[PDB]
Swiss-Prot record:
Role this protein plays: RNA-binding protein with binding specificity for poly(C). May play an important role in neural development.
Lineage: Eukaryota, Metazoa, Chordata, Craniata, Vertebrata
Localization annotation: Cytoplasm; Nucleus
Glycyl lysine isopeptide (Lys-Gly) (interchain with G-Cter in SUMO2) crosslink location in chain: K15
Whole-protein residues included: 23 to 194 of 476
Gene encoding the protein: RBM45
Organism: Homo sapiens
Protein known as: RNA-binding protein 45
DNA sequence: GACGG
DNA sequence: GGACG
């Protein structure tokens, strides 16, 4: 229902954009599992808010990257906003920032240098920065590393496609 | 502009 | 198994 994480997008749309237009415009980006136009309890009208759940986080991220800022109708004045949605549990409505989506955390052989890591992970997208966690006295690698990509979908692709022995997960922010 | 079926 | 002087 909510698996995998970061596979649901949050939309700020026109109150007059129906679910069918969301399906037509967002289905190219992946396997849609649920489209949900949020309606006001008292008027039963759209609040101008929607959720779209995709089968993969990479699909949700590509949808966000391509569709944020687009318009969906002639009567629509403002562009739509598309974010990765917060979970139902907790998630105090705060917008997920791109910095929380672009960096992955991997287990790697001790022999890897930062350029070895970049070589193995450049195939999933444009890498902004690679680092390896080392003993800062001796310089020896602790076998853990970070890869930050330019786009959230690139980090999602890496997590979904790289060898399972890397144990690739989204990296928590430092603070 | 944030949570149903 | 797992975290950034």
């Amino acid at each position: 229902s909510h698996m995998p994480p970061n596979s649901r997008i949050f939309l700020v749309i026109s109150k007059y954009t129906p679910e069918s237009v969301l399906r037509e415009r967002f289905s190219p980006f992946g396997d849609i599992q649920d489209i949900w136009v949020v309606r006001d309890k008292h008027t039963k009208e759209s609040k101008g808010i929607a959720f779209v759940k995709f089968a993969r986080s990479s699909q949700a991220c590509r949808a966000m990257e391509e569709m944020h800022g687009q318009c969906l109708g002639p009567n629509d004045t403002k562009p739509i906003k598309v974010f990765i949605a917060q979970s139902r549990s907790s998630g105090s409505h705060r917008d997920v920032e791109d910095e929380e989506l672009t960096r992955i955390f991997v287990m790697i052989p001790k022999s890897y240098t930062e350029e070895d890591l970049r070589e193995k992970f450049k195939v999933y997208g444009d890498i902004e920065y690679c680092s390896i966690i080392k003993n800062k006295v001796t310089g020896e690698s602790k076998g853990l590393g970070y890869v930050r990509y330019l786009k959230p979908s690139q980090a999602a692709q890496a997590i979904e496609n790289c060898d399972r022995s890397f144990r690739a997960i989204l990296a928590e922010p430092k603070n």
